Structure formats: C-alpha cells, structure tokens
C-alpha cells in the first residue's frame, strides 16, 4: 500500500516507506491571471522539476529543538535559476519531499514543516510549530515526508530577489537513539519541485 | 562493473557517484550482455534500453539511489547529484519490492544511431548514464546488482559481421 511515485516534469521519485501527501493551506493555486500583471504573464513548464539539497546531519548529540531551515527559493543553477535572473516577477507553489534514511532499529522523531514568512522562533514557540503544514519522520515507521503548498503572499507576483515567502524547516522532536544494529548518523536530504511557475516582465540582458 | 562484478557496493565517502557508463552497445560495462551480443552483428539501432536495478541487502539496511541520463553536449560528466539532478533522472528507495526499472530513452538527432564507437574521437555521440547513491543507512557492504535488456520499441536494422576469424 505504502508505495508512492511522484512525477514532476521529466523526473520521478519512488518511495516504498511513504505515509501520504500533506496539502498545506489549500489543494491548488488561486487565480493566476490578475489585474496587476496586465495579462502579460506566461507559464514556464520547463522549470517544474526536482532539485536536491542537503539539510543537516542528524546525529545523537542534537537535543530537542534543533531547528534547521531552508528559505525557498534557494540558489538554483538550472532553468529556475535563469528564470529568477531573467524575468522580473515570478510566482510558484512548492512540492517538497524530505528523506532521512537510517534503519528500522533507530529511534527518534523529526518534525518537517513548511513555514510562511519565516521569523526566528523563541525557545518557547517551538512547542507549537505543529500549526504549520507538517509531517513526521520516524525511523520506526517511515523515511519520507511529503508536503505540498500553494503560493501565498501579500502580492500576487513576487520578486524572489527581495522576498522569499516559504521556508522548509526540520526540528528534532525526539533525539536519535541508536543501538548496535542501527545507523550511527543520519543525513537529511531534501527534494523540492516548483509547480505552476508563472513569470512576467522580462528584463534586459547582461551579455 | 570493475573487476568483473555485476554489482556496485555502497561506498562510505563524500563522493556519491556509484558508476558511470556510456550509452553505446559497445561500451565496456555492456561487453558481456546478450543485448550487445546481438547488436555487434548489426549496423544501426533505435529505441529505449531498460536497466533493472535489484537490491541485495539485508533487512536491517536501507539505501536511496538515483539514476540520471546525461545527454551529449557537456564536457565533463557530473560528479554529484546536486548537479546531475537537472537531467532526466529517477530516484528510488529500498523496501518490500527490491527492483527498479529505468528506461534509458532514445534522444538523438538522426533517427538511427551506430552501434560502434567510430574512431579515437572521445565524448560518445550518445550521452552517458550515471548511477548515484543519495544516502544509505547501515549498509556497509551490501550490494546492488545491475542488469540491462531491450525496450518495448528497440530495433536493429542492418546485418553485418565484423568479428575477425
């Protein structure tokens, strides 16, 4: 039952220890054409594909409350990187998938969430981080968290040079407990894919 | 693969490129397969080529692999998944079902392509394929067996016999 296969563009991702997909704050995009862009917007289907990233090394020394973030979008080299630098205004939702493979004899729990409009959390607010679109990663049950969120912001189109709405966040809810037959460290990798990449207002070249 | 083993072992390193081979029915990694055994007697080919990866680890070890098809045009093949992730790739985990099938597509200018590397010219006319290892958990020695077979629309065209007697 727990065999999932996510396909974006011409790339795929299969997982045999999945727990489900978590839709955060909506199931789809709002109206993409608006009165501000004056209908001079287009869609770039070539950008909607995965790109990998490295979050952190989940060791045994990190206690409750270790918070590791990734402000999206990040420094991208593919077609998305050129889109950020070539068109003035962009908008896109995210489809994020985080994997932390140990083996079934470890223990511990990761809270993987997506936070809009990141702001540094005080040691007390971290107890309510579960208000956001989130899942859990527990080597007892699963090894893959899969969240998907639309584009939400005060402006219909944004300038990702100045304002980065979403932030992927991973917190260690229960520290890793290892045995003689469990992994001694875990490496948490991320796999993110933009969806509905709309662009508007092309810029002059630097060549 | 190296030393004539059909499996690649999980490596403990910061470099996570398990293997890399040219998409050419004369490649060194395909020198023993039945598919190349046929294709050596034909002039041109066309179609998709399937690769089957089978995990052979113990129940207490996990891993997550990725295979990407790097087309021709790049000078140096990528050496890390963060960079090769932009090609046509596929990722898979290890669980109950231990097999994974990836269809190396046929993407090239001419509708048919040769089955022999022409001359001392390098950088194969068809691109490489790189099998990476994203991460692994408590799999120190456990292997991954790789096999190759024909696709749903593979086709060989012109009969020859180049083997010297």
């Amino acid at each position: 039952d727990r065999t999932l296969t996510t396909r974006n563009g011409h790339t795929t991702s299969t997982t045999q220890s999945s727990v489900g997909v978590t839709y955060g704050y909506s199931t789809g995009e709002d109206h993409v054409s608006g009165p501000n862009t004056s209908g001079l917007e287009t869609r770039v289907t070539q950008a909607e594909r995965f790109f990998k990233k490295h979050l952190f090394n989940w060791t045994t020394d990190k206690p409750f409350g270790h918070l590791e973030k990734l402000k999206l979008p990040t420094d991208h080299k593919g077609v998305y990187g050129h889109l950020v630098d070539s068109f003035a205004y962009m908008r896109n939702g995210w489809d994020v998938e985080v994997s932390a493979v140990g083996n079934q004899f470890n223990g511990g729990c990761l809270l993987v969430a997506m936070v809009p409009e990141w702001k540094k959390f005080t040691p007390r607010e971290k107890y309510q981080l579960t208000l956001f679109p989130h899942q859990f990663i527990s080597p007892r049950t699963n090894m893959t968290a899969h969240i998907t969120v639309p584009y939400l912001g005060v402006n219909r189109y944004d300038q990702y040079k100045k304002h980065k709405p979403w932030t992927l966040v991973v917190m260690v809810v229960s520290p890793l407990t290892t045995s003689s037959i469990g992994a001694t460290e875990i490496k948490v990798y991320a796999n993110i894919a933009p969806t509905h990449v709309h662009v508007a207002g092309e810029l002059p070249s630097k060549e | 693969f190296d030393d004539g083993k059909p499996y690649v072992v999980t490596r403990e390193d910061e470099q996570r490129l398990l293997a890399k081979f040219d998409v050419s029915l004369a490649a060194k990694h395909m020198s023993n397969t039945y598919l190349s055994g046929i294709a050596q007697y034909y002039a041109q080919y066309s179609g998709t080529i399937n690769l089957h990866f089978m995990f052979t680890g113990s129940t207490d070890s996990k891993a997550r692999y990725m295979v990407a098809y790097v087309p021709p045009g790049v000078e140096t093949p990528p050496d890390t998944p963060e960079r090769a992730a932009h090609c046509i790739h596929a990722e898979w985990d290890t669980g109950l079902n231990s097999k994974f099938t990836f269809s190396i597509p046929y993407v090239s200018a001419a509708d048919y392509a040769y089955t022999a590397s022409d001359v001392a010219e390098t950088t194969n006319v068809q691109g490489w394929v790189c099998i990476y290892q994203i991460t692994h958990g408590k799999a120190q020695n456990d292997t991954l067996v790789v096999s190759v077979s024909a696709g749903k629309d593979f086709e060989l065209r012109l009969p020859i016999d180049p083997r010297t007697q």
């Epitope: 001694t184 | 403990e12 390193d13 910061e14 120190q140 020695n141």
Partner: nanobody, 119 residues
Framework: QVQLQESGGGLVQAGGSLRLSCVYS?????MGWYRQAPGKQRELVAA???????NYRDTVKGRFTISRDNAKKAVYLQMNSLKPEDTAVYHC????????????????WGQGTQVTVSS
C-alpha cells in the same frame, strides 16, 4: 568537502611508539590512514568504519591500532613496535569499503604529519 587536520608525528628510535591524531569536520564517513613512503606510491595502512569494524594492511597488522571518537570527532592511530620502514608522511581522510581497503582519491589532502623512525 572536509577540513581535517593531523598531529602527533615526529622522531623516535627503533622499537618506540607514537599516537597520531586527526580531527575532521564533515559527517561520519569511514576514515583511514594513508602513508607516502619516500619514493613510493601512497598506500593505505589501516581503516575504520563508522563506529565499529577495523581493517589493517598485511605488513602493519598486529602492531598498529586504529580507534575512533565520534563525540570529539577524532581518529587515532597507535603505532607500536616501529621499524625503519615505517617512515613517511601520514595523511588521513575518507576511505571506501574498509573490507577491501580501497582508498579514495577524491580530493584535497592536508599535509600535517611527518614521522621519522631512526636506527
């Protein structure tokens, strides 16, 4: 990829002993000790896994002892019953497949340890 430093080498007579230490910064990959004999190729000596199994070269087997400390992020090589042959520069960095002992020509090395056994 990793920034790692070595220390502990020096000069000693035949039959002495030494303790080489190395400190690294990235992850928990299986480390090992390499030596470049004067005028010979760089060769692996002893390798250790991630919190566990160790493996030694044929010549240095039984006289050396490698150990790891995960908390301090350090690896140690205790050298006993030294011989004039063991003089070299003892580098340390990651190693793949400590069973077969296949070293990694991956990247940059740090030259920090020089051992000179006398006789």
């Amino acid at each position: 990829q990793v920034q790692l430093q070595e220390s502990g080498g020096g000069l000693v007579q035949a039959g002495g002993s030494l303790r080489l230490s190395c400190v690294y910064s990235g992850g928990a990959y299986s480390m090992g000790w390499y030596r470049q004999a004067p005028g010979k190729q760089r060769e692996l000596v002893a390798a250790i896994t991630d919190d566990g199994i160790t493996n030694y070269r044929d010549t240095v087997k039984g006289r050396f002892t490698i150990s790891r400390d995960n908390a301090k992020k350090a690896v140690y090589l205790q050298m006993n019953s030294l011989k004039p042959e063991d003089t070299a520069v003892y580098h340390c960095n990651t190693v793949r497949r400590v069973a077969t002992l296949s070293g990694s020509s991956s990247g940059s090395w740090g030259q920090g340890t020089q051992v000179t056994v006398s006789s």
